[model samples]
Structure formats: structure tokens, C-alpha cells
Target: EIMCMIRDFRGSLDYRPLPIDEHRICVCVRKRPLNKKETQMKDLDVITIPSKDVVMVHEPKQKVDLTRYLENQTFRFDYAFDDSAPNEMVYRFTARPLVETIFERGMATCFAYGQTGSGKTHTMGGSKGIYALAARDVFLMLKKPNYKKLELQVYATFFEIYSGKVFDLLNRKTKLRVLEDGKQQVQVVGLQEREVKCVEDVLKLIDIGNSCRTHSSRSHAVFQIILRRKGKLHGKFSLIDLAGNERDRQTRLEGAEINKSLLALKECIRALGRNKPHTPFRASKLTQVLRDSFIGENSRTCMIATISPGMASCENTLNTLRYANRV
Candidate 1:
């Protein structure tokens, strides 16, 4: 069975834009929602998962408008709540603190979920010269004054899910097949994972991966995952920017290849929720390679679960939020 560490930020979990004639609905209906003993043999055509297990990390509603209310001031992590919503609370920890604590304590982990074009990349800190909490930690620990004189080696690998296949952005390898390890852990076959020793190399590799990754086209969509390793994580973190969920019509994907890949990712997660046997993470290269990480057996996990707070993305956002619960 796969174990998981999940983060849930606020988003609606109600509707989804379906790909016409796609089979997700069928699986949802047929698959037991919560791994219950009881099974229904009726229409078997609609999917419904409960909304209880999700941990919600929400942005406080009431804002002090630091731009005007407080001149020349910075925003604080601490926030006040809106009287209308009590469950909505301030975020106490930044992503770096969360990651540092998790790694310091020895955690084995990976994170990926959400619809296409969601802020998965941005939330996980994927921008040139941008130093999110995680990046900051990486730099801080590596700085001369703070650098530890230990056996510290850092490596990273990046890949993408494009047009129903997996390709390594860091190397010249062909599309890899997602496969199950002997222990049923999902991993990729034939994709190259590179290791880096210096901070310059790490940054350079990220740039290369970003350059090689597929941009919008029939080529497919892409995201980056960085594997950090230093003395059992003296410098290691598994960071993933996943393909956004697609509404059948809006997804801009087509043909059997695209649909099939999407289905594979969905089924893999669905299986985790239902405790189903013979799950097919290997069905897609991304899921297969990430098999061990998704289980979160050894790592503290976090999901930035992004939402647009716009009408167009309401359903997709909501559906993602609910899935985050199951995750």
C-alpha cells in the first residue's frame, strides 16, 4: 500500500470539465469511493468522494491592505481572520520551515496533484532567479559561513509528461516507460537522473531542464521535479511540478495517447484511495517513476494546492481540492 503526506489549501471540490466520451466517469462510478465493504451494482456511472479527510490551509480573508493601510511595510506571515469564516486561519509556517523540518527529521517523500495550468510550478517555486523558501534553504545551507563540512552531495533530475509519454528534460534519453519496482513501487525505466556537486551546477541544470521542457504544442505538457540529496538529505528534496488537470474540451489534448496517459494518472491515485489491488502507476511514466515518493513513507509531504479564485476554474479547482483530501 502507498502512504501519503498531503497538504490542502482552500479550493472548491465540486465540478469537473469532462473530456467527451472519456472513461473517467465510468471508473469513478465503478470504483468504491472510500474502500468500503459494500458495493453497488446499479448505474455505476457517477463518481463521488467524501470531503472529510482533507486538511485545509487557507489564506485569511480579512486583509490590512499593506499597500495603503500601512505605508512602507512588509506583509507578515501572521494574519487575522474574517469573522464570517472561523476555520480560515493564518499560515504559521513557510514552505522552507516545513521542508527543513521534514528533511531534518528524515523523511522520504514526493508530491504531485492538481489540474493543468494550476499554480503547481509557481507554488513549488519554479521561476528563474526566484528564491522561494525551499530555494532559500538550499542556498543558506550551502553558503560558506553556513556550509557544513560533511559528505554533502546534491543531485537533481527533471522530466515532463507530454502528449501521453514521459521524457527526461535533463538528458538525451527517449521517452521512458513507467514501471513497477520489484516491490510494486512505481518508477521510470530509461529516464536519466543527474546528480550535481556545486550550487552553480544545480542552478544551471534547472535552467537546462526548463529550456528543454516542452512548451505548449502537440509535443505535450511538462513540469519539473528536483531530487535533492545530501547525507540522507543533507541536501535532498523531491519537488514536482505536475501537469494541470484538463477539462476534456479545454485540455487541448486529443487522441488515444493523450487520454490514456491522463487516465493512468487518475487511476493510480484512485487506486490509492480505494486500497485497490494491482494499481497501475506504471501505466504512465510519471506515475511509475514517482511511485515510491507518492507513498510519503519516509518524508514529510506538502501540497500547495493552488486555486485561481476565478469562475473558469471553479469546478476544476474544487475537484482538485477534494482529491487533495483523498491524497
Candidate 2:
């Protein structure tokens, strides 16, 4: 078995911390461990890390052939996290700095992306995910005596894009709409935004939203937090859990719509990160809702791209790494 061989090749692997990129967008990859089904199927590990910013994918050509016609895919990003890396490390590396900036009246965004069952939700929506850690850090920062002198108000909203339509997750069963105004500002009409005074308030709303979204688990969930000073808006933080990328054969129409929106998102990021002239923010409902985070002058963004380690997932993993590279 390849696993046995890998175990014998390197009993323990070491990973070093990667530097954060704050000047522009941050793109990182998270390689999750083999799932139960992958292990049961005897799929070999084809992903490897040569440095903190590079990941290589090796596709076996024939039976027990290691050197004949092997396909190699190497991707480089702002940072990389191997399977052994924990969620807290990700929070510290990607979300912490962004949270600090948000507290200082700057807009920031973080999103988890990849194929189905690639741990995107586990990385961004759970109790210990980036959202919770960022909220906790916000509260901690506000606890300082100096910060107590400033008037701060926090508001939260949870919604999703499903099948080319928008739905409000916090206010169960409510359908929403996306519209762009004359000044290039996008708004989610009919969406409920709640005001919170503490971190527990935010977490409670997150739990309720997560519960309501269980029915349409494949939809993209966007959790946004806005901060105001003296009733004047100052900063916004959007945490997005994007829907899984599926093949057309498996998902048909829904997959087509999902891929469309994902492509729109990638294009927006590409244009913004490269300072291009035309950024297509209105191409999809998902991008329309996130237009502010991608186009604004002070917008900062971080992307966590998740990938599976099983050989069965080689194609999807390669596509995900390529997508991250494009963004």
C-alpha cells in the first residue's frame, strides 16, 4: 500500500509557518486528511508539499509504475497548510490579522472554497472556525480601556445563494433578492440584519443560521459583521462558506449554476488583486452580494482553498489548486 510506503519513507514530517501577505489578497491551501471512505477504498496519497507555498500533485500512470508517463501538477500560492495542520493555526495565520484590520475601520473578507466534502464548512462555520475565532478576538480587542472610550456597535447578517437565488438563513424561510444601485453598491433586499452587543450574540445567530441552512447544505453561506462608530458605519467583515464545486454529471443544473457563480467570484478576485480595469461583480448573485468586499479601496481579502488527499480526488484537487492559483 502507498500508505505503508509513505509511513516507511517519512515517519514524521515537519511544517514551518508561512508569512502572511497583507499588501494584496491572500490565497492559501488546506489539504485535509483522507476521509473514511477514501481510506476504505485504498486510495493513495498523491499530494506533496515541497515548501511553505508550493503543493505538488502526482498522478500514477499505470499499475505499480512510478516513473512512466506520470502526470505532475505543481501549484504555488501565498501559503499552504498540510493535512496535519490544525484549524487554530489557520485562524491565527489568515483571520487574525484581518480581524485586527477590521477593528480599525477597514473592510476585510475571508472565504473557504473547494470541492464537495473538502472541509470548507469545517474550516469556516464550526465552533472553532475562523468566524468564532475572529469574533472572540474582536471582543478581546474591544476590552482594552482605550477602546472603551469609543462608541462601537456591531451588526450581523447571515444569508445564502441557492440555485441562482438568495435566501435569508437567520430569518428562516425568507427569500431575498440582490440589487445593485447607481453608485455601484450591492444590497440584499429583505435580508434581516441583527444588532449584537457581545460575542455570544454573534455565535448564537451563527448557530441558528447554520441550523436553518441544513436543508440546503450545498448553498453558499455568507456571514457578515459590520461595525459602526457613533451610528456611522466604519468597517465590515464578511465570512463566506462557498458551496462545493460539483461535476455536471453529478449535479446537472445546480452544478452549472454553482460553477457559474464560482467563476464570477474568481474573475472578480483576479481583477481586483491585479488592479485591472473591469471587475465583473454583477455576473452572479453571489458576487453581487460580495461586491463591496472585492472592489472597495480599503478591502482586504483572504481565501482558504481546501483539497482532499485521496487519489480518487486527484482531478478535483487539481482543479481546486488551479482555481486558487487563478484567484
Candidate 3:
């Protein structure tokens, strides 16, 4: 039941569409103040950075790309309250509402993908003290009057693909469990995939999950959060924070257990792209958990690709853009 669709990867630092009421909206690279009206529209093709630039080295241990973004632009990224969007949402993002034609026919899924240290985590997880405004926008949209009339009740499920195994972010354990069906696709068990009532609840759950997540040199965790209501997904977005995809020498993690885990994640995603008969969800814990959502009947999908704009990540950036194009 997998449907493969290819989307163009229009390069821009933060270019995913957002939802405003019933519309999907995006902002120009030169941000206008939240209080000001959106006067202009700019396309992705228009975004171009200087060819001769150096990645900024912020710290001694941080091997980050020194590339600068918005080199000469004076726009600011203020996560403060946005007057344009309802519910006093803070971030400046466009609305990407799902088409009824697609949803009435099936489910919709959006996810995040990219190399390690990319903005995937930031786009999804948000900063420590600030609210993840994009997530908030989604939450508020669901609570709109149209959604209320449908008698929908939303629920959230969280799981992390780590160390070649899937662990429930809501649970603290060392055991391994998988969920699959007659078709042989896989799923993971014991993860706290719970019913969330409101934006407040989702934030609370994420805050708690962040505390329980497993982080170490030998192991890293990738999180997938699912949304559902009344046994069906009206529309769902996955806030994925993928692990580091590093070369052997750059990561010092090559040919080791972490390397294998990274390979498993990549392979699982590869299968989803092919729409083939057999997808090895069990190849890694992450795929096992997402088995149903990716290949199941009635699914619309989008992916947020994160990559550093710098020389050190030239290869990774290109690779990520290629994958985003597929999603």
C-alpha cells in the first residue's frame, strides 16, 4: 500500500510550507516583522549564497561548517509572538494544509531527514526554553472549528530508533520488542504512543521524553512522533530528529556499531522510496516502528531536509537534498 511520489528540493535554509487556517503559507527569505503585513513573495530559485565563503568555527571541539547564511541580508529570526498567525504563535512559517482530495482518499504524513548536527533537531525539537512554534501552529490548526465539528480526538505516540533497536521514549527499558504482520513488515513495541488531548499535552509529553531519551557516544536516538484521532489520521506530521550521518574519519564512529545503525536507518528509508514488495523495517529499529505509516494504505507525505550550508558538509548537503527531492 505504499505510494511513492517525488517532490522537488528547492534549496533554502528554512523553506517548508506552514499551515495558516486552511492555507499553506511560506515566508520570504527577507523576513518582515510579525506586526507588518507580508508585502512580497520570493521563490526558492531566487535564493543564492556567495560561492566564496567560510564556515564559522564557533567552538574548538565543534567541527561545524563555517559557511555563513544570509550573508548580506539583515533579516532577523525572532521566535517571538506572530500577530499574523492566530493563537499568538511565535515563529514565522507558512501554512501547508492538506488537500481534501488527498486526505479524503487517505492519510497524510510529513517527516524530517538530514545529516547529524543539521537543523532537523531545531526545526522539530525547537530550542530548550522556547516553544516549538511550528508544532504549535499545527496544534492550534487542529483545534479550529472545522476540526471540532468532526468530533476528532487526537493522540500522540513517541518512539526512538537507537542502537539498532526501537525504544519507547515514554518508557525506560533495555529490552527489545518488534511489531509486524503477515506481510513481514515490522513494528516496535513498548513505546509510549499515547493519546494527547491538546498542544499543552503534547508539549508536556515532549518535555518528558526529552528527559528520558538515551544519549551517548556509542548510541544516539532518533525520534518519530505520530498523530492520530478516532482511529484515523486526519493529517500527521513527524517531527524527526535524525542522528549523525558522518563519514568514518569525520565521526570516529565508522565501522562501529553506530555505523551499522546509520546504515539501517538509510536502508529503511530507501525501501519506502521504492514502493517495493518487501521493505526491511526490521533492518533497524526506526523502520520497524514506522512500518505501518510509510507503506500502509492512504498516506500523503512530506519531508523537512536539514543540512548545514558549508564546505565541510558539501557532500552531506547534496545527499540530503537528493533525499528530500524524493519525499
Q: Each candidate's TM vs. the true structure?
A: 0.52, 0.89, 0.56
> Where in model 2 is the C-alpha error above 4 Å?
1-21, 63-70, 183-185, 215-217, 248-251
Using lDDT as the yardstick, the better of models 2 and 3 is 2
Q: Write the per-residue lDDT of candidate 1 for residues 149-224, one digit (tens) a residue.
A: 4444445566666666677776743677775668543456766656655556666666676667644222332322
CA displacement after TM-score superposition, residue 31 of candidate 2 (Å)? 0.7
Clash tally, candidates in order: 22, 0, 18
Q: What is the lDDT of residue 183 in candidate 2?
A: 49
Worst 10 residues of 1 by lDDT: 1-10
TM-score attained by model 3: 0.56
List the candidate 1 regions with Cα displacement exceeding 4 Å.
1-116, 125-136, 139-150, 177-179, 183-190, 215-236, 248-284
Report the alpha-carbon TM-score of model 2 versus the true structure: 0.89
After the best TM-score superposition of candidate 1, give how far the Cα of residue 224 lies from its true spot, in angstroms.
Answer: 7.9
